[PDB]
Amino acid sequence: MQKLTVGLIGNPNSGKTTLFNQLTGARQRVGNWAGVTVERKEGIFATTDHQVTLVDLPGTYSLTTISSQTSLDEQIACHYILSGDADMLINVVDASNLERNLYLTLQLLELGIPCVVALNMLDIAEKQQVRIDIDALAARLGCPVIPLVSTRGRGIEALKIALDRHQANSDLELVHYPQPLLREADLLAQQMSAQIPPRQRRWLGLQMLEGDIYSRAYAGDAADKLDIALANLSDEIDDPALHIADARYQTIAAICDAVSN
Numbered sequence: 375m376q377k378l379t380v381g382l383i384g385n386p387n388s389g390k391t392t393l394f395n396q397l398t399g400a401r402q403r404v405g406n407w408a409g410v411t412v413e414r415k416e417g418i419f420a421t422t423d424h425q426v427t428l429v430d431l432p433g434t435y436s437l438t439t440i441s442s443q444t445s446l447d448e449q450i451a452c453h454y455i456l457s458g459d460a461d462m463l464i465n466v467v468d469a470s471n472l473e474r475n476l477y478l479t480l481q482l483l484e485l486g487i488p489c490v491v492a493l494n495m496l497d498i499a500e501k502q503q504v505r506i507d508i509d510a511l512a513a514r515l516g517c518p519v520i521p522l523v524s525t526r527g528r529g530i531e532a533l534k535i536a537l538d539r540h541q542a543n544s545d546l547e548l549v550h551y552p553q554p555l556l557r558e559a560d561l562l563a564q565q566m567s568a569q570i571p572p573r574q575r576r577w578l579g580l581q582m583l584e585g586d587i588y589s590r591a592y593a594g595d596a597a598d599k600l601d602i603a604l605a606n607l608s609d610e611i612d613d614p615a616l617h618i619a620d621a622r623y624q625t626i627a628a629i630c631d632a633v634s635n
């Protein structure tokens with residue numbers, strides 16, 4: 375029995391609290407994110423091989439801020455995910471709004487954090503005549519995808535086995551970004567703290583290029599973005615932030631269509 379730290383993440387209203395309580399029962403403590411007002415719930419449970427600490431993370435639709443005035447809430451889950459204190463994540467997805475929920479899902483697989491998706495609200499999706507091919511969705515995301523109805527407590531056991539068994543998401547060419555954006559995101563990548571693993575480094579350069587406000591603080595060379603963007607003014611010219619998003623959205627668009635009836 376190894377101790378294992380899992381983060382619980384999701385868009386707001388994906389049924390994350392329900393799930394938190396199904397997993398931890400009465401064994402949960404209420405605290406706050408360090409130096410701040412936002413509440414940090416955390417609790418515990420045991421699968422066949424791990425004694426897990428589950429750390430609830432604030433709802434967010436996206437990790438990336440292109441923006442100024444988002445929130446403190448939405449801005450903290452990035453920070454935690456990137457710190458490494460979590461060994462794997464549970465991604466709570468509202469099956470009834472897949473395409474919209476998968477933006478966040480897809481940023482996490484791009485970060486590379488081991489990840490199991492809790493496809494929650496399978497009953498709401500049926501009531502809307504939405505059928506989803508789970509096996510197919512897992513084959514496209516590269517990570518387990520486990521069916522849930524948190525209200526009833528359906529799937530909690532399979533969600534746990536999944537966590538016992540999953541180690542590493544499948545290594546996938548998920549989003550096709552245009553080459554110049556990549557070339558700069560690696561330029562930006564390769565001049566950053568070596569503790570930060572290579573995928574995450576890359577991901578952050580993409581984020582920097584895209585406009586992310588609070589990403590500049592992990593880089594150690596944002597002294598250096600202004601020139602990345604200029605070297606691009608020729609190439610995938612007008613708008614890096616457009617083509618960056620577009621590529622993720624087409625990815626998620628294609629997935630959703632492969633797999634929803």
Ligand SMILES: Nc1nc2c(ncn2[C@@H]2O[C@H](COP(=O)(O)OP(=O)(O)O)[C@@H](O)[C@H]2O)c(=O)[nH]1
Nearest residue numbers: 386387388389390391392494495522523524525
């Ligand atoms: N019908 C249905 N409702 C759910 C399911 N999961 C959570 N809910 C309900 O969805 C609403 C959102 O729940 P909550 O856990 O607070 O969402 P959170 O903000 O994302 O934590 C609540 O009324 C829950 O009772 C589910 O699988 N099916």
